[PDB]
């Protein structure tokens, strides 16, 4: 009615195909165009090659789009920047603007979870940010998480933000959290945080049933798992953090806040490590959508 | 059903779906004086009517929770005064319990006004993170109820007596969307100006309005903060609100004032010590948050 | 469905009879075998004698059982401490993984709620943790009670604890909060906290009233009372304090973190008292399932 589902999208849901929606954000806001269309294409074709559908998720002149069209791709992406930064709370100022609009996380989430997609694929979620005693600066990505059943497939947490709060916050929102293969919770650009996962699972098989028990409970809180960057491509942990204390320092004193941050941030890390953080970014999240849609597709089997 | 009572007016008003706004009812028992508090009642109801809306005064009233008083409610409520239990959605079955007289604070009249189908209620301010709350945790259900309530709230902002920063960051993390009608500064409840940035920005009633509907539209179960600046005739700016609420909050805390007697204890002093202009300014923003809210409200029903 | 319900639990439910959720972490992580099992008969039995029927719930291979068989308590009570700590973020996982599972009272107040459960007898209920400001620890307790209906029956919150935080984060997630026939919030093992109740509530039928009053309003938001524990049976607060001071001070120097604090410091707060704490926690569970019995029973004379 008001939600414009791609043909391809809503086939393999009435046929309980496998599905991975994907957020537009990154496409946005992430990388400079051309290549953020390059790399979105490229997900889903990860996708797509692992035996899942890909649902990206947009708001195009006021319409929610789950799945895009390659037309309608290329149009979000030649946009690049100007397209508004869209979390959950936004959906509904961006389709009464009749605006254009990519999703974050708790904006994806939310359109994923309302047309039954049960697999979202991410490169990282947001979290507590740094000093938030002081600011209560938290993602809605939490929040949301917490209040809707779906798996969210991360590579964990950026450095940027409060490891530690963040897995403390997502404990009491009732998220279930678990690292892939290793007992140590991975920080997106590198594959080492410092903290231990409070849980684990072992291969895209043991994903799948902890989500389907999830959804026969009909529990009404969502899962996190974190894959840790394949190994060969985590960035140095001394060069990501010197460059994320200087950007944070940045963020301060030119009152950066809201939901300008994360961006600002990210890009800002990306510029003093000289490619090396976008790289690792651009790593984790193609091997998200392998371990994404393997785990997607395992689930179909299941059900 | 068998448990609430809806006046005829608002019953019809919800039946046919004529413009309706809802309104609390402790700014009438524990936010104004027994004379004001009255009056601006009064002239609050007549505003939202003379612009199309229905308002629907929210209270319980001998256990029994009424959307929508009479002009008779209405005086009975507000010279019971503080004998009323100032109540917040976590009270509400505990009223009920007891056959209590209870006036419903933000949380309490969102979940009235929600369960009825009223998309627009009109307050003042709305209650926020509280200063010093890294060791308190001193934080409003208001926020936590409007973060699940898909309901529009029109407020004149938050009161500096709180931490607007916080709040605001407290809002985001719940999934409020929050507008600042008509400015790029949210506003700050008796002034204009807080210091911070609005999220995002509305400009005019129908704006409002198509952004409730999408809302509704979509199903979600979040609700929406429209702040509106008071008018720059009624601000209290001038007036050293800031030093005020400072001191206030200072005697406060020196005399042990706590719990449920504190804003009334600094609505008091500080309007004792802006010689009138604090309590001036409530009834202004009150009055234009009223008028803004209804012409939100008749807008939404043209396009529902 | 995927929840098993006991023959008598089935039928009490069916017929309108009073019912009491009853968790079962103290049976695997309160005492040794098989003095673990002849308490859990007690206070079961105490649930029986005063007019309801008592749902232990619990995870086992599998399966979530609300309402044990006296095989399946004995079950729990061999398996001991080898049980997992199950809150609600768990469950899927355990379920998943065919394990047995110890629910805590975010985990049991979902199964009870779910099968339309209205009273739940604990001891104590987790909170907000001390120093909380700088590391957001805070149990899934308090935001699961924020969201599910049904009445949580206590001895308020124990003092290695952030009471007062505790107190304010619960009205912030609009749970009303009551002391039994007292203006004092009680504190677990002893009966004063140093903290005024919120609310008070002065019998199991007025206990009752309210939450017929919260059913009937359907508000998606639960209850608890605490209920102090008998003034015979109360732990004196020095003796309590000096032991709980050294244990908070213990875990600190241990890095004791997440869903281990509490089992931790409960343990050890036994050990340095003597047996005292864990003598009076099981007086105040005692106490907490004759009066949840009662207000249960009256719940269902009013309904
Ligand atoms: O490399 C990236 N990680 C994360 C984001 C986005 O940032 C959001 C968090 O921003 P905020 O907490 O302001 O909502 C996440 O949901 C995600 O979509 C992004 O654009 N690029
Ligand atoms: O003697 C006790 N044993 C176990 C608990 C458990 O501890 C939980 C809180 O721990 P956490 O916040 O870490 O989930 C409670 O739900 C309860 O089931 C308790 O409170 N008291
Ligand atoms: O959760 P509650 O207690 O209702 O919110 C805190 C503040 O919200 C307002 O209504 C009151 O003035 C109170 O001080
Ligand atoms: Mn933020
Ligand atoms: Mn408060
Ligand atoms: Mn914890």
Do not use: W
Request: aromatic share 4%; proline share 4%; net charge neutral.
């Amino acid at each position: 009615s008001l939600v414009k589902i791609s043909p391809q999208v809503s086939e393999a849901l009435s046929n309980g195909r496998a599905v991975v929606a994907l957020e537009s954000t990154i496409i946005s806001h992430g990388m400079p165009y051309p290549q953020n269309l390059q790399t979105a294409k490229e997900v889903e074709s990860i996708v797509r090659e692992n035996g899942a559908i890909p649902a990206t998720i947009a708001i195009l002149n006021g319409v929610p789009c789950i799945g895009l069209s390659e037309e309608e791709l290329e149009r979000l992406a030649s946009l690049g920047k100007s397209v508004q930064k869209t979390a959950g709370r936004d959906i509904a100022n961006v389709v009464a603007t009749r605006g254009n609009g990519a999703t974050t996380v708790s904006a994806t989430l939310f359109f994923a979870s309302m047309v039954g997609i049960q697999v979202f694929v991410t490169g990282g979620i947001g979290g507590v940010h740094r000093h938030a005693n002081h600011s209560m600066d938290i993602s809605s990505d939490l929040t949301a998480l917490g209040r809707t059943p779906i798996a969210v497939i991360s590579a964990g947490v950026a450095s940027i933000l409060d490891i530690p709060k963040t897995l403390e916050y997502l404990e009491t929102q009732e998220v279930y959290v678990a690292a892939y293969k290793s007992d140590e919770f991975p920080a997106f650009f590198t594959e080492k945080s410092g903290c231990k996962a409070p849980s684990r699972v072992n291969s895209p098989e043991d994903c799948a049933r902890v989500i389907d028990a999830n959804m026969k409970l009909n529990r009404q809180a969502g899962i996190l798992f974190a894959i840790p960057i394949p190994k060969h491509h985590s960035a140095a942990g001394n060069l990501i953090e010197s460059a994320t204390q200087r950007a944070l320092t940045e963020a301060r004193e030119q009152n950066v806040t809201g939901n300008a941050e994360t961006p600002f941030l990210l890009a800002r890390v990306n510029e003093l490590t000289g490619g090396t953080s976008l790289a690792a970014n651009i790593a984790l999240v193609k091997n998200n959508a392998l371990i994404g849609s393997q785990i997607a597709v395992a689930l179909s089997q299941l059900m």
